[PDB]
């Protein structure tokens, strides 16, 4: 078997050089998965992938190349493609079922290869087929650790969480969707006060507070979130006469009769402040003026004679 030894060398050479005609004259079911004798003992597929021979990769795969075959160091062809930034080769290999987190004898994955050589686009492609950038090699190092810029480190993390969310969504895996979303900031809380961004926005003196409030609500803000003193955003807006945002909160389902820790509604706090239009609006929204606070007061009992007048109707 010295002919299939020389023939092999020529098949390999055709693969490496991108010689399509020579490849298909030499490629049989007996040498399609042959390994070189010296060097790294690459298969044709390894060589075609490393040297970016896209058409050769198509033909090899089409004629039974083993996408999981190993070179002397435990690299699969996906390693070769990723290490030298061959995007389209990478995509082809993945399309034919390459293991996105295949590990060589040093526990290097394809993403270790791409990340360490700053193959930004290859990294994103890998992450989109489920590459995991937290897996460590024999030196205790992840793809994140080898990425040479903060922009790329941030991107590996962001895109990894992103695709874990997308896949959990595809699988309707509720627990996994919850988990990957556990760190969303929309309802992040001031640790001391328990206020969220919505509480802060409706308290704002600044001109765009209406727009900010709308935006936070569109993006998941809990309209009835309670701070340390059981104040909802409505309570906060009402006591400051921030009428524009009050409307926004109403629109998004604010509970008009929410009670703070003193048993007061937004209407109590507006009345107490002497905010006349605020009281009119709260009334129109369905606030209940009979509610008796824990100190024994209706809103009218805490307000000026104008508030009293407004409330007695």
């Amino acid at each position: 078997v010295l002919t299939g030894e020389y023939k092999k060398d020529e098949l390999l050479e055709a693969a490496r050089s991108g010689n399509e005609e020579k490849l298909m004259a030499l490629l049989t079911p007996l040498n399609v998965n042959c390994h070189a004798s010296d060097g790294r003992k690459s298969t044709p597929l390894h060589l075609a992938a490393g040297y970016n021979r896209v058409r050769i990769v198509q033909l090899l795969l089409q004629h039974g190349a083993d996408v999981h075959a190993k070179d002397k160091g435990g690299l699969v062809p996906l390693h070769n493609a990723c290490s030298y930034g061959h995007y389209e080769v990478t995509e082809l290999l993945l399309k034919h079922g390459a293991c996105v987190n295949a590990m060589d004898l040093w526990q290097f994955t394809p993403l270790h290869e791409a990340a360490s050589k700053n193959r930004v686009e290859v990294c994103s492609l890998l992450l989109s087929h489920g590459a995991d950038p937290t897996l460590v090699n024999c030196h205790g190092k992840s793809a994140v650790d080898m990425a040479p810029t903060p922009e790329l480190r941030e991107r590996l993390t962001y895109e990894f969480k992103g695709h874990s969310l997308l896949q959990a969504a595809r699988e309707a895996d509720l627990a996994k969707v919850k988990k990957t979303l556990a760190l969303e900031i929309i309802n992040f809380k001031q640790p001391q006060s328990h206020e969220t961004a919505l509480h802060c926005a409706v308290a704002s003196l600044h001109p765009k507070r209406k727009q900010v409030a709308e935006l936070l609500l569109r993006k998941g803000a809990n309209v009835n979130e309670k701070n340390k003193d059981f104040m909802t955003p409505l309570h906060v807006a009402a006591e400051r006469a921030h009428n524009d945002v009050m409307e926004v909160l109403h629109k998004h389902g604010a509970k008009m009769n929410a009670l703070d820790s003193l048993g007061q509604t937004a209407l109590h706090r507006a009345a107490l402040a002497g905010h006349l239009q605020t009281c009119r609006l709260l009334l129109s929204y369905g606030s209940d003026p009979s509610i008796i606070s824990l100190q024994g007061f209706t809103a009218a009992q805490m307000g000026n004679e104008a508030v009293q007048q407004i409330l007695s109707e």
Binding site: R16, H46, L47, Y51, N52, D71, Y84, H86, W106, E113
Partner: peptide, 12 residues
């Protein structure tokens, strides 16, 4: 065991 380099070449 110094890890080698995959067979292949950068484009261009």
């Amino acid at each position: 065991s110094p890890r080698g380099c995959a067979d292949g070449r950068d484009a261009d």
